[PDB]
Design a protein around this ligand. Structure first.
Ligand SMILES: CC(=O)N[C@@H]1[C@@H](O)[C@H](O[C@@H]2O[C@H](CO)[C@@H](O[C@@H]3O[C@H](CO)[C@@H](O)[C@H](O)[C@H]3NC(C)=O)[C@H](O)[C@H]2NC(C)=O)[C@@H](CO)O[C@H]1O
Ligand code: UDH
Ligand code: MN
Length: 272
């Protein structure tokens, strides 16, 4: 098989996105026949240089997840990616830890296949243009750059939350993500700091191609704003040396291979 072309010729650009209808994953699976068990796909006509594991931090967001799957699967295939979907489900009902779940995703997906690119995406963000590439670049990539909830622009220029892509080397270089941001906020800013402290810069598509829709929702219980966040992001340079992949432990309770994704249910504990 020859290599796929540098840019996929299958892209259609701007798309219509809506979240007012019901979604049936059995149907979605039917519409996406080429997606194999566990939400895995690779083009059959060419070899993709992009081996992407898409990691979604998750707990009690099944409805959002169905929309995510309905919209992303067709887009990822048009992008001719060799990819896999991983939903990292936080076991239990104690305070949520978005970034720690993302580290679990990185470590566990690597046990399945030689992925060399990682896309970290919240479950309620849908790209509006398939030219917004869900793969890695020479520098860390911020993907959800123009979200409707932020008026189709970045909330601030150093904002790196929502959807992003880091190559395996970029992720390893920053010792992954922090494990101690419990509850909402700051962990994405900490990650931005990590990248800067390791000599990297943020790469982004333009505002139009990067347009993204956020499924408006209510505040989830157990993910209250972390009061220590402003304090923690001010010391990233020092804390990133000892807090991240090199200080991570967790216990996988279950791994389910659904037609459109792999769900890893994991116990990531409580604050220490
Ligand atoms: C110079 C100065 O102090 N200016 C203040 C502004 O920074 C401040 O805006 C708010 O800043 C915080 C921290 O950057 C923003 O929080 C981030 O929001 C994103 C998106 O929701 C989230 O992913 C990040 O985790 C979160 N980080 C933290 C540490 O909480 C917040 O969204 C900004 N708000 C607005 C409306 O732009 C404003 C208002 O608080 O006051 C200035 O003085
Ligand atoms: N007016 C409505 C106020 C809603 C403010 C709640 C904060 O909203 P956001 O900043 O979008 O964050 P969030 O969507 O709650 O969390 C980000 C991501 O964490 C995941 N997440 C968070 C909390 C939870 O209980 N379950 C879950 O899966 C999910 O992938 C989500 O998209
Ligand atoms: Mn949200």
């Amino acid at each position: 098989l020859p290599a796929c072309p540098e840019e996929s010729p299958l892209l259609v650009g701007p798309m219509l996105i809506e979240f007012n209808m019901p979604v049936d994953l059995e149907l979605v699976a039917k519409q996406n026949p080429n997606v194999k068990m566990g939400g895995r796909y690779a083009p059959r006509d060419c070899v993709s240089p992009h081996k992407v594991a898409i990691i979604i931090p998750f707990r009690n967001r099944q409805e959002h997840l169905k929309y995510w799957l309905y919209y992303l699967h067709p887009v990822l295939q048009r992008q001719q990616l060799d990819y896999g979907i991983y939903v990292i489900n936080q076991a239990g009902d104690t305070i949520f830890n978005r970034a720690k779940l993302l580290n679990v995703g990185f470590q566990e997906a690597l046990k399945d296949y030689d992925y060399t690119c990682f896309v970290f995406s919240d479950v309620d963000l849908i790209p509006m243009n398939d030219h917004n590439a869900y793969r890695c670049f020479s520098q860390p990539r911020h993907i959800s750059v123009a979200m409707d909830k932020f008026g189709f622009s970045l909330p601030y220029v150093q904002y790196f939350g929502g959807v992003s892509a880091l190559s395996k080397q970029q992720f390893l270089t920053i010792n992954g993500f922090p494990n101690n941001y419990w509850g909402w906020g700051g962990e994405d800013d900490d990650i931005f700091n990590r990248l800067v402290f390791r000599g990297m810069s943020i790469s982004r598509p333009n505002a139009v191609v990067g347009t993204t829709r956020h499924i408006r929702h209510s505040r989830d219980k157990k993910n209250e704003p972390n009061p220590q966040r402003f304090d923690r992001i001010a010391h990233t340079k020092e804390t990133m040396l000892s807090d991240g992949l090199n200080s991570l432990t967790y216990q996988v309770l279950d791994v389910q291979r659904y037609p459109l994704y792999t769900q890893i249910t994991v116990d990531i504990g409580t604050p220490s």
